[PDB]
Symmetry: C3
Subunit: 30 residues, 3 copies
C-alpha cells in the first residue's frame, strides 16, 4: 500500500475517531 | 500490510472505536 | 517494496486504541462540566 493511502488512513482515523466519540456521546443525550 | 490486511484493520478498528466510546460513557454514568 | 515492521504496526494499532480511549474520556469529562 502507498504512503499516500496511509496518510489518508491515519488522518482519516483521527477525524473519524473524534466524530464517532462525539456522535456516540450525543446519541446518549437523546 | 496488504490492501486486504489494511481493510481488516480499518473495519475492526472502527467497530472497536464505536464500542470503546460506548463503554466509556456507559461506565461513566454508573 | 517497503515492507512495514510487525512490531511498529502492532505498536501503532495499540496506540490508536489508547488514543481512542483518551478521546472518549476527554469527551466524557468535558461533557459533564
Ligand atoms: C466486522 C466486525 C469486526 C470486529 C472485530 C474486532 C477486532 C478489534 C480489533 C481491531 C484492531 C484492528 C484489527 C482488526 C482485525 C479484525 C478483522 C480482521 O481480521 O480482518 C481480516 C482482514 O481481512 C485480513 O487481515
Ligand atoms: C469478535 C469481536 C467482537 C467485538 C466485540 C468486542 C467488544 C469488546 C468490548 C467493548 C466494550 C463495549 C461494552 C458495551 C457497553 C455496554 C453499554 C450498554 O449495554 O448500554 C447501552 C447504552 O449505554 C444504553 O443506551
Ligand atoms: C494513527 C494512530 C495514532 C496513534 C497515536 C498514539 C500516540 C502517539 C504515538 C505515536 C503517533 C505516531 C504514529 C502514527 C503516525 C506515524 C505513522 C505515519 O506517519 O504514517 C504516515 C506514513 O508516512 C504514510 O504517509
Ligand atoms: C474517512 C476515512 C476514514 C479512514 C479510517 C481509518 C481507520 C484506520 C484504523 C486504525 C488506524 C491505524 C492505521 C494503521 C495503518 C497505518 C500505520 C502503518 O502501518 O504505518 C507503519 C509505517 O511503518 C509508518 O509509516
Ligand atoms: K480509532
Amino acid at each position: 500500500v502507498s504512503p499516500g493511502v496511509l496518510a489518508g488512513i491515519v488522518v482519516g482515523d483521527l477525524v473519524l475517531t473524534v466524530l464517532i466519540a462525539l456522535a456516540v456521546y450525543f446519541l446518549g443525550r437523546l
